[PDB]
Amino acid sequence: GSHMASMREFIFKANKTITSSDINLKDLPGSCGRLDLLCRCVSDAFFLSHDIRRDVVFYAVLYGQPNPPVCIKFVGSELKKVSPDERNIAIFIKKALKKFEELDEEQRKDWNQSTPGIYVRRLGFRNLVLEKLEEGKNIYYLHMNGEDVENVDIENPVFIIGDHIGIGEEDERFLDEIKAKRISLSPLELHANHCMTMMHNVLDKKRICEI
Amino acid sequence: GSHMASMREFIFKANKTITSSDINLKDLPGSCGRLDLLCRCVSDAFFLSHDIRRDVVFYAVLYGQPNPPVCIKFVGSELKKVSPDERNIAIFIKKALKKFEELDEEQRKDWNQSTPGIYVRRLGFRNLVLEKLEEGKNIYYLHMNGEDVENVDIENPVFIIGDHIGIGEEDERFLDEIKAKRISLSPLELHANHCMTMMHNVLDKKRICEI
Ligand SMILES: [Mg+2]
Ligand SMILES: [Mg+2]
Ligand SMILES: [Mg+2]
Ligand SMILES: [Mg+2]
């Protein structure tokens, strides 16, 4: 074995997801701007059968009205009292957005914990990716026309996952500029949350041959 | 290519999921008996990015109080007005259970449509599996100690997926008896809904090399 372990980190850009705590739990998809999708991504990033993945960090950058961008960071090793269902996760996200509302613009420059393992910050998608590059991460863009993941060595990863409409031409230009490596998990276009499930499975299996 | 296509069919045994329409949407996991899990399984069985999988049939057999068993059958090619979020699916399941409540015991011997593509019937797990065997299906049991799916030819499949506690010693005996083939998708124990995602991905990829 190589005995190499690394954090699995994901960034999901939520193009339209609501950025105030004024959340209608009864319309997560419509009035909340596909908040349901974001909740499933959180669920799929962390939850196993009788456990939570302690090596995962998940970042969501929300661009919906009225206060974008808001970045919410979930740290698997620290999360308490989150369960895999959308309603529970949505309430945790509501709490995070409420915390963000209580902070001034200076305070929002930093990560601010709302509940254990959940932090909010004024941070956009590109600045977040830059910050990860400076830490030494490799950026991988999960995109259906990328290299077959089967053949790529993955090291110190940050996985980028777009939503229903996607990252957009602007941010693709940017990923191209910083040399993000595109990887494919499937011949079909999947929901963002399915990508994370596939990506975890790829890494779980490599762990068996290689580490 | 072989030009071979087949229906992808799944059976999920929901050990504790509620069997009346008296459903608390605000406690899908607790008072509904892990109804949230069943909803995610439905979601993951059917939904792609800009589509629904028309070659899938999903069966759920619910064993929770007060009227078990209830079998709900979802037919991908027929579903209308279902979206991927748990709340929407839970309401469709509520409707199905309401339909079941309105039928007498004789009427429950047959499939009874509640909403397009959704049918309810008094049918237990074993009788359902028997019925599928008699139709010519091969039964595959997704179980973490099974053969690596990579190496198994899959033909005319019905995939069995247990829940959080699992199929149970009784029904395992039965699957052993009828010679169900056990297949593994992962070195880790996953949520039932993740199995379906992995299983779809395996089939989508084979479709590319072989069909
Ligand atoms: Mg690792
Ligand atoms: Mg950071
Ligand atoms: Mg097929
Ligand atoms: Mg039938």
UniProtKB/Swiss-Prot annotation, chains A, B:
Specifically catalyzes the N1-methylation of pseudouridine at position 54 (Psi54) in tRNAs. This is tRNA (pseudouridine(54)-N(1))-methyltransferase. S-adenosyl-L-methionine binds at L142, G162, L185, S186, P187, L188, E189, L190, C195. It comes from the Archaea. GO terms for biological process: tRNA methylation. Homodimer. Disulfide bonds: none annotated. It catalyses: pseudouridine(54) in tRNA + S-adenosyl-L-methionine = N(1)-methylpseudouridine(54) in tRNA + S-adenosyl-L-homocysteine + H(+). Its EC number is 2.1.1.257. It is found in: Cytoplasm. GO terms for molecular function: S-adenosylmethionine-dependent methyltransferase activity; tRNA methyltransferase activity. Belongs to the methyltransferase superfamily. TrmY family. One of its GO terms (cellular component) is cytoplasm. Keywords: Cytoplasm, Methyltransferase, S-adenosyl-L-methionine, Transferase, tRNA processing. HAMAP family: tRNA_methyltr_TrmY (MF_00587).
